[PDB]
Write a protein that binds this ligand. Structure first.
Ligand SMILES: [Zn+2]
Length: 257
């Protein structure tokens, strides 16, 4: 019964998921004064022109926008990656207040939210086999700050009322994830983990330097979602982030000077 509440939050996850105290856990703090430029990194290739979104689901921890991943339609390549990684879903983590909500931090700065675009390595055939491999997933992480509205986010905002409670889903076709990207694709990269149970150490993280801006009204609608199911006492879906974990024997590399 893991979650983000008073008695089941991140500090308790290790009792059911001992890898929570592992060597390659995520998120981490990104220290911009020790991350080193790596000239061997190749430019990032984000290929989302043929993406096919299907559905949006409130899973009781966040909401997922799900894609058709049965063909190479929306893929991530280049950067630190070898091979081709297929987009399966995106989701967000956010706060109760604008000064918290991100999972990664930058020189200890917390952003209001963080977007995760989750991709799996096609050499492993399916997502469930990929998560068992150290190079199975690639997650593109994008910070959100509160300021101007993000036009490309509004179709997500407007469907949230239909998926207020745990277990609800809605059709969500023809959504273009390119409208969630910042101008620059400059990034930091390091090896890590899923940030929710089962916390598997299968992810190459690619965290963009440039945040996107969303409006106060857009974030306020995120904060009206519920962790609970229909007909249960209301528990607002806020503060669904894991804090920074020890870097241990890892280096964060920068794509940019
Ligand atoms: Zn996430």
């Amino acid at each position: 019964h893991w979650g983000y509440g008073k008695h089941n939050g991140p500090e308790h996850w290790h009792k059911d998921f001992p890898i929570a105290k592992g060597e390659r856990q995520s998120p981490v703090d990104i220290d911009t004064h020790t991350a080193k430029y790596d000239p061997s990194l190749k430019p990032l290739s984000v290929s989302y022109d043929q993406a096919t979104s299907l559905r949006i689901l409130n899973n009781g921890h966040a909401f997922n926008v799900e894609f058709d991943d049965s063909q190479d339609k929306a893929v991530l390549k280049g950067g630190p990656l070898d091979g081709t990684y297929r987009l399966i879903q995106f989701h967000f983590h956010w706060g109760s207040l604008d000064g918290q909500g991100s999972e990664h931090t930058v020189d200890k700065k917390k952003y209001a939210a963080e977007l995760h675009l989750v991709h799996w390595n096609t050499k492993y055939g399916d997502f469930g086999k990929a998560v068992q491999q150290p190079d199975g997933l690639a997650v593109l992480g994008i910070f959100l700050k509160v300021g101007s509205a993000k036009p490309g986010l509004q179709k997500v905002v407007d469907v949230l009322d239909s998926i207020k409670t745990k277990g609800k889903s809605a059709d969500f076709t023809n959504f273009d994830p390119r409208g969630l990207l910042p101008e620059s694709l400059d990034y930091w990269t390091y090896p890590g983990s899923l940030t929710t149970p089962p916390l598997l150490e299968c992810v190459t993280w690619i965290v963009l330097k440039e945040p996107i801006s969303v409006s106060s009204e857009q974030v306020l609608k995120f904060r009206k979602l519920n962790f609970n199911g229909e007909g249960e006492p209301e528990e607002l879906m806020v503060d669904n982030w894991r804090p920074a974990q020890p870097l241990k024997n890892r280096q964060i590399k920068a794509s940019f000077k």
